[PDB]
């Protein structure tokens with residue numbers, strides 16, 4: 660027998676109730692502007708499927724960010740465009756300004772509003788325990804918005820969070836792997852980055868949903884408050900689960916697998932072994948104890964769960980006592 664089906668416990672039928680053209684991105688018509696409106700200034704970074712430059716708009720002389728798309732199925736370009744168009748103006752989501760094709764190369768590129776990245780080396784030694792609570796709240800704002808809009812990000816990881824520390828602005832970026840939730844759909848499990856892949860991805864369980872984003876978010880929190888990056892440091896995808904099982908124990912993992920009737924690769928059938936679920940205090944030490952609190956350890960533990968039904972939702976997470984202080988200051 661095959662796996663047990665699963666449904667998201669919030670925002671389940673949000674896409675069912677919308678007009679079709681909301682989520683049916685394969686038929687979306689995109690009008691491609693001219694990239695020579697823009698002049699590339701300097702590289703900002705480079706992903707596996709993008710290449711980000713700061714540019715100026717030689718018409719209104721404005722800063723702007725141009726992301727050249729790498730050669731991917733037309734489909735997935737329309738999807739990222741559709742999702743960005745669907746989320747424009749939402750809290751802490753990046754803002755799409757234009758969509759262009761270079762005249763000669765004919766390579767597609769997305770054009771976004773300008774943001775400044777804070778010296779990523781600054782963040783290490785400046786981030787107070789409160790600062791983590793704040794920028795984590797901002798991230799849950801963006802995830803709750805987009806889950807309410809029927810979209811999962813599927814690539815939540817620090818290289819996809821823009822922070823402007825001077826102005827305390829955060830933007831969630833790279834929507835190239837984002838996808839619409841449709842109850843009962845089976846999604847590709849070759850998504851996210853290793854260190855942030857949720858258990859459901861490593862065991863190939865295809866009816867995942869928004870809670871995938873809450874696992875990854877738990878990995879960031881894990882790596883922030885313990886100053887251990889990445890927190891589950893896997894040599895490959897099979898090993899990654901073993902790194903997780905050494906922390907979360909195997910008894911819960913094998914419960915997870917029996918509850919969903921997952922069949923397990925014969926590869927796994929000897930590398931996982933037996934492991935107790937470790938206590939979070941094992942990971943505290945003199946140089947991270949100022950970011951670790953009983954509240955943070957409760958909050959973190961309520962995200963890193965095998966069973967995806969039982970992870971917090973973005974909305975429940977923003978209600979955790981971890982965030983009491985920052986909610987107070989927002990008035």
Ligand SMILES: CC(C)Cc1ccc(S(=O)(=O)NCCN2CCC(COC(=O)c3c[nH]c4ccccc34)CC2)cc1
Pocket residue numbers: 703704705711724726753771772773774776777778779780782791794795798817818819820821822832833879883
């Ligand atoms: C919850 C806490 C707080 C955890 C945390 C710690 C550190 C950081 S971090 O900020 O240090 N992360 C390193 C990544 N940074 C941002 C991306 C850079 C490349 O790519 C782009 O810049 C754009 C891609 N698309 C865009 C659209 C508009 C503007 C720019 C881009 C590379 C440098 C964030 C969160």
